[PDB]
Protein backbone atom coordinates (compact mmCIF):
# COMPACT_ATOMS: atom_id res chain seq x y z
CA UNK A 1 0.00 0.00 0.00
CA UNK A 2 0.99 3.65 -0.37
CA UNK A 3 0.92 4.25 3.40
CA UNK A 4 3.16 1.20 3.85
CA UNK A 5 5.61 2.57 1.26
CA UNK A 6 5.74 5.93 3.05
CA UNK A 7 6.28 4.23 6.42
CA UNK A 8 9.19 2.09 5.14
CA UNK A 9 11.19 4.87 3.43
CA UNK A 10 14.13 5.96 5.65
CA UNK B 11 13.82 12.16 37.06
CA UNK B 12 10.45 10.86 35.79
CA UNK B 13 9.23 14.41 35.19
CA UNK B 14 12.62 15.33 33.72
CA UNK B 15 12.23 12.49 31.21
CA UNK B 16 8.71 13.71 30.32
CA UNK B 17 10.15 17.16 29.55
CA UNK B 18 12.90 15.56 27.46
CA UNK B 19 10.21 13.66 25.57
CA UNK B 20 8.21 16.88 25.09
CA UNK B 21 11.30 18.59 23.66
CA UNK B 22 12.13 15.64 21.41
CA UNK B 23 8.60 15.77 20.00
CA UNK B 24 8.78 19.54 19.47
CA UNK B 25 12.16 19.26 17.71
CA UNK B 26 10.77 16.47 15.47
CA UNK B 27 7.63 18.51 14.81
CA UNK B 28 9.79 21.42 13.64
CA UNK B 29 11.72 19.11 11.28
CA UNK B 30 8.56 17.46 9.89
CA UNK B 31 6.20 20.43 9.50
CA UNK B 32 7.54 23.45 7.56
CA UNK B 33 4.40 25.53 8.35
CA UNK B 34 4.40 26.01 12.15
CA UNK B 35 1.80 27.92 14.16
CA UNK B 36 4.55 30.33 15.24
CA UNK B 37 5.45 31.08 11.61
CA UNK B 38 1.78 31.24 10.60
CA UNK B 39 0.88 33.73 13.37
CA UNK B 40 3.92 35.84 12.42
CA UNK B 41 2.43 36.08 8.91
CA UNK B 42 -1.23 36.54 9.93
CA UNK B 43 -0.56 39.23 12.56
CA UNK B 44 1.99 40.92 10.26
CA UNK B 45 5.12 40.52 12.42
CA UNK B 46 7.41 39.45 9.55
CA UNK B 47 9.88 41.13 7.17
CA UNK B 48 8.98 38.51 4.52
CA UNK B 49 6.48 39.13 1.72
CA UNK B 50 2.85 39.76 2.69
CA UNK B 51 0.54 36.99 1.43
CA UNK B 52 -1.50 37.58 -1.73
CA UNK B 53 -5.15 37.83 -0.68
CA UNK B 54 -7.74 35.84 -2.65
CA UNK B 55 -11.30 36.97 -1.81
CA UNK B 56 -13.23 36.48 -5.07
CA UNK B 57 -13.04 34.96 -8.57
CA UNK B 58 -11.12 37.93 -9.96
CA UNK B 59 -8.42 37.89 -7.26
CA UNK B 60 -8.15 34.09 -7.62
CA UNK B 61 -7.35 34.53 -11.33
CA UNK B 62 -4.77 37.23 -10.56
CA UNK B 63 -3.03 35.24 -7.82
CA UNK B 64 -2.63 31.98 -9.78
CA UNK B 65 1.16 32.37 -10.08
CA UNK B 66 1.63 33.50 -6.45
CA UNK B 67 -0.04 30.32 -5.11
CA UNK B 68 -10.92 24.24 -18.13
CA UNK B 69 -12.30 23.17 -14.72
CA UNK B 70 -14.63 25.42 -12.71
CA UNK B 71 -13.27 27.33 -9.71
CA UNK B 72 -14.93 25.18 -7.01
CA UNK B 73 -13.35 22.03 -8.48
CA UNK B 74 -9.97 23.76 -8.91
CA UNK B 75 -9.95 24.81 -5.25
CA UNK B 76 -11.11 21.34 -4.08
CA UNK B 77 -8.23 19.72 -6.01
CA UNK B 78 -5.90 22.25 -4.33
CA UNK B 79 -7.07 21.13 -0.89
CA UNK B 80 -6.48 17.52 -1.97
CA UNK B 81 -2.88 18.14 -3.04
CA UNK B 82 -2.06 20.00 0.18
CA UNK B 83 -3.68 17.13 2.17
CA UNK B 84 -1.49 14.63 0.28
CA UNK B 85 1.58 16.68 1.23
CA UNK B 86 0.32 16.85 4.82
CA UNK B 87 -0.18 13.08 5.05
CA UNK B 88 3.49 12.66 4.11
CA UNK B 89 4.61 15.20 6.75
CA UNK B 90 2.47 13.50 9.40
CA UNK B 91 3.90 10.09 8.46
CA UNK B 92 7.43 11.43 8.94
CA UNK B 93 6.47 12.91 12.30
CA UNK B 94 4.80 9.66 13.40
CA UNK B 95 8.02 7.76 12.65
CA UNK B 96 9.86 10.05 15.12
CA UNK B 97 7.56 9.11 18.05
CA UNK B 98 9.50 6.71 20.30
CA UNK B 99 8.22 3.15 19.82
CA UNK B 100 6.16 3.83 16.67
CA UNK B 101 8.45 2.25 14.03
CA UNK B 102 8.80 -0.88 16.21
CA UNK B 103 5.02 -1.51 16.07
CA UNK B 104 3.61 -4.13 13.71
CA UNK B 105 3.72 -2.43 10.29
CA UNK B 106 0.05 -3.04 9.61
CA UNK B 107 -0.75 -1.34 12.93
CA UNK B 108 1.37 1.64 11.88
CA UNK B 109 -0.73 1.81 8.68
CA UNK B 110 -3.94 1.62 10.73
CA UNK B 111 -2.84 4.43 13.06
CA UNK B 112 -2.11 6.73 10.12
CA UNK B 113 -5.25 5.76 8.20
CA UNK B 114 -7.52 6.77 11.08
CA UNK B 115 -5.30 9.53 12.45
CA UNK B 116 -4.19 11.68 9.53
CA UNK B 117 -7.40 13.63 8.93
CA UNK B 118 -7.80 14.41 12.63
CA UNK B 119 -4.25 15.83 12.52
CA UNK B 120 -4.97 17.66 9.26
CA UNK B 121 -7.93 19.45 10.93
CA UNK B 122 -5.71 20.25 13.92
CA UNK B 123 -2.83 21.60 11.87
CA UNK B 124 -5.10 23.51 9.48
CA UNK B 125 -6.26 25.55 12.51
CA UNK B 126 -2.66 26.81 12.95
CA UNK B 127 -2.92 28.47 9.52
CA UNK B 128 -6.41 29.93 10.03
CA UNK B 129 -8.11 32.86 11.66
CA UNK B 130 -11.80 33.78 11.60
CA UNK B 131 -11.24 35.57 8.26
CA UNK B 132 -9.34 32.97 6.17
CA UNK B 133 -6.54 30.47 5.64
CA UNK B 134 -2.87 30.64 4.68
CA UNK B 135 -2.03 28.61 1.58
CA UNK B 136 1.07 27.90 -0.51
CA UNK B 137 3.53 28.02 2.40
CA UNK B 138 2.00 31.33 3.53
CA UNK B 139 2.34 33.04 0.13
CA UNK B 140 -1.45 33.22 -0.28
CA UNK B 141 -4.39 33.99 1.99
CA UNK B 142 -7.80 32.75 0.86
CA UNK B 143 -10.79 34.24 2.66
CA UNK B 144 -13.30 32.13 4.58
CA UNK B 145 -16.13 34.06 2.90
CA UNK B 146 -14.85 33.20 -0.59
CA UNK B 147 -14.51 29.51 0.34
CA UNK B 148 -17.93 29.34 2.02
CA UNK B 149 -19.55 30.95 -1.05
CA UNK B 150 -18.32 28.21 -3.42
CA UNK B 151 -21.27 26.31 -4.91
CA UNK B 152 -22.85 23.27 -3.29
CA UNK B 153 -21.47 20.87 -2.20
CA UNK B 154 -18.01 22.54 -2.03
CA UNK B 155 -18.79 25.54 0.21
CA UNK B 156 -19.99 23.18 2.97
CA UNK B 157 -16.84 21.06 2.53
CA UNK B 158 -14.66 24.08 3.42
CA UNK B 159 -16.63 25.68 6.24
CA UNK B 160 -16.42 22.95 8.94
CA UNK B 161 -12.62 23.26 8.89
CA UNK B 162 -12.98 26.94 9.90
CA UNK B 163 -15.69 26.09 12.45
CA UNK B 164 -13.31 23.70 14.20
CA UNK B 165 -10.35 26.13 13.91
CA UNK B 166 -12.21 28.95 15.65
CA UNK B 167 -13.07 26.76 18.64
CA UNK B 168 -9.65 25.04 18.76
CA UNK B 169 -7.65 28.27 18.42
CA UNK B 170 -9.53 29.66 21.45
CA UNK B 171 -7.44 27.19 23.47
CA UNK B 172 -4.27 29.19 22.56
CA UNK B 173 -1.99 26.16 22.18
CA UNK B 174 1.56 26.69 20.92
CA UNK B 175 3.70 24.43 18.74
CA UNK B 176 5.22 22.72 21.82
CA UNK B 177 1.72 21.83 23.06
CA UNK B 178 0.60 20.75 19.57
CA UNK B 179 3.54 18.39 19.02
CA UNK B 180 2.46 16.30 22.04
CA UNK B 181 -1.30 16.59 21.28
CA UNK B 182 -0.70 15.28 17.75
CA UNK B 183 1.46 12.40 19.06
CA UNK B 184 -1.27 11.36 21.50
CA UNK B 185 -3.85 11.31 18.68
CA UNK B 186 -1.67 9.19 16.38
CA UNK B 187 -1.00 6.61 19.14
CA UNK B 188 -4.69 5.77 19.71
CA UNK B 189 -5.09 2.14 20.79
CA UNK B 190 -8.79 1.99 19.90
CA UNK B 191 -8.53 2.49 16.13
CA UNK B 192 -10.58 -0.15 14.29
CA UNK B 193 -8.62 -3.24 13.24
CA UNK B 194 -5.46 -2.84 15.36
CA UNK B 195 -3.77 -6.19 15.98
CA UNK B 196 -1.58 -5.44 19.04
CA UNK B 197 -3.31 -2.91 21.27
CA UNK B 198 -1.23 -2.88 24.47
CA UNK B 199 2.05 -1.58 22.99
CA UNK B 200 0.15 1.36 21.50
CA UNK B 201 -1.75 2.05 24.74
CA UNK B 202 1.53 1.95 26.73
CA UNK B 203 3.09 4.54 24.38
CA UNK B 204 -0.01 6.72 24.53
CA UNK B 205 -0.14 6.56 28.34
CA UNK B 206 3.37 8.02 28.47
CA UNK B 207 2.56 10.66 25.84
CA UNK B 208 -0.54 11.62 27.85
CA UNK B 209 1.63 12.08 30.96
CA UNK B 210 3.97 14.28 28.92
CA UNK B 211 1.00 16.29 27.63
CA UNK B 212 -0.45 16.80 31.13
CA UNK B 213 2.90 18.10 32.45
CA UNK B 214 3.39 20.29 29.36
CA UNK B 215 0.01 21.95 29.89
CA UNK B 216 0.53 22.38 33.68
CA UNK B 217 3.85 24.17 33.07
CA UNK B 218 3.04 26.09 29.85
CA UNK B 219 -0.55 27.04 30.78
CA UNK B 220 -0.48 27.23 34.59
CA UNK B 221 -3.54 29.52 34.74
CA UNK B 222 -5.71 27.12 32.70
CA UNK B 223 -6.30 23.98 34.78
CA UNK B 224 -9.09 22.91 32.41
CA UNK B 225 -6.94 22.66 29.30
CA UNK B 226 -5.92 18.98 29.51
CA UNK B 227 -9.51 17.80 29.97
CA UNK B 228 -10.62 20.10 27.13
CA UNK B 229 -7.96 18.68 24.80
CA UNK B 230 -9.04 15.10 25.66
CA UNK B 231 -12.56 16.11 24.58
CA UNK B 232 -11.22 17.65 21.35
CA UNK B 233 -9.65 14.28 20.50
CA UNK B 234 -13.12 12.73 20.84
CA UNK B 235 -14.79 15.57 18.89
CA UNK B 236 -12.27 15.15 16.05
CA UNK B 237 -13.50 11.60 15.36
CA UNK B 238 -17.04 12.86 14.78
CA UNK B 239 -15.68 15.78 12.74
CA UNK B 240 -13.68 13.47 10.45
CA UNK B 241 -16.55 10.99 10.05
CA UNK B 242 -18.61 13.92 8.67
CA UNK B 243 -15.75 15.00 6.40
CA UNK B 244 -15.46 11.46 5.00
CA UNK B 245 -19.24 11.28 4.45
CA UNK B 246 -19.14 14.58 2.55
CA UNK B 247 -16.27 13.29 0.41
CA UNK B 248 -18.27 10.12 -0.37
CA UNK B 249 -21.16 12.39 -1.43
CA UNK B 250 -18.86 14.46 -3.67
CA UNK B 251 -17.35 11.31 -5.23
CA UNK B 252 -20.76 9.97 -6.32
CA UNK B 253 -22.56 13.25 -7.15
CA UNK B 254 -19.78 15.10 -9.04
CA UNK B 255 -19.14 13.70 -12.52
CA UNK B 256 -11.07 13.18 -9.20
CA UNK B 257 -9.61 11.75 -5.99
CA UNK B 258 -5.87 11.36 -5.32
CA UNK B 259 -4.81 7.68 -4.91
CA UNK B 260 -3.34 8.26 -1.43
CA UNK B 261 -6.62 9.78 -0.25
CA UNK B 262 -8.60 6.99 -1.97
CA UNK B 263 -6.52 4.50 0.03
CA UNK B 264 -7.09 6.32 3.33
CA UNK B 265 -10.87 6.62 2.84
CA UNK B 266 -11.36 3.05 1.57
CA UNK B 267 -13.10 1.05 4.33
CA UNK B 268 -12.59 3.85 6.89
Ligand SMILES: CCOc1cc(CNC(=O)c2c(OC)cc(O)c3c2OC2=CC(O)=C(C(C)=O)C(=O)[C@]23C)c2ccccc2c1
Pocket residue numbers: 067074075077078079080081082083117120121124133134135136142147157158159161162
Ligand atom coordinates in the same frame (compact mmCIF):
# COMPACT_ATOMS: atom_id res chain seq x y z
C1 LIG C 1 -9.11 18.00 5.21
C2 LIG C 1 -9.29 18.34 3.73
O1 LIG C 1 -8.19 19.16 3.29
C3 LIG C 1 -8.27 20.52 3.37
C4 LIG C 1 -7.09 21.24 3.11
C5 LIG C 1 -7.07 22.60 3.16
C6 LIG C 1 -5.77 23.30 2.86
N1 LIG C 1 -5.94 23.90 1.53
C7 LIG C 1 -4.93 24.49 0.86
O2 LIG C 1 -3.80 24.53 1.31
C8 LIG C 1 -5.24 25.06 -0.46
C9 LIG C 1 -6.46 25.73 -0.68
O3 LIG C 1 -7.34 25.85 0.35
C10 LIG C 1 -8.55 26.60 0.18
C11 LIG C 1 -6.74 26.25 -1.94
C12 LIG C 1 -5.82 26.11 -2.97
O4 LIG C 1 -6.10 26.63 -4.20
C13 LIG C 1 -4.63 25.42 -2.76
C14 LIG C 1 -4.31 24.91 -1.50
O5 LIG C 1 -3.07 24.31 -1.48
C15 LIG C 1 -2.72 24.01 -2.75
C16 LIG C 1 -1.95 23.13 -3.38
C17 LIG C 1 -1.87 23.05 -4.77
O6 LIG C 1 -1.07 22.09 -5.26
C18 LIG C 1 -2.68 23.84 -5.63
C19 LIG C 1 -2.64 23.61 -7.04
C20 LIG C 1 -3.46 24.40 -8.03
O7 LIG C 1 -1.89 22.76 -7.50
C21 LIG C 1 -3.54 24.85 -5.06
O8 LIG C 1 -4.25 25.58 -5.73
C22 LIG C 1 -3.41 25.11 -3.58
C23 LIG C 1 -2.55 26.38 -3.53
C24 LIG C 1 -8.25 23.32 3.48
C25 LIG C 1 -8.28 24.74 3.55
C26 LIG C 1 -9.45 25.39 3.87
C27 LIG C 1 -10.62 24.68 4.13
C28 LIG C 1 -10.63 23.30 4.07
C29 LIG C 1 -9.45 22.60 3.75
C30 LIG C 1 -9.43 21.18 3.68
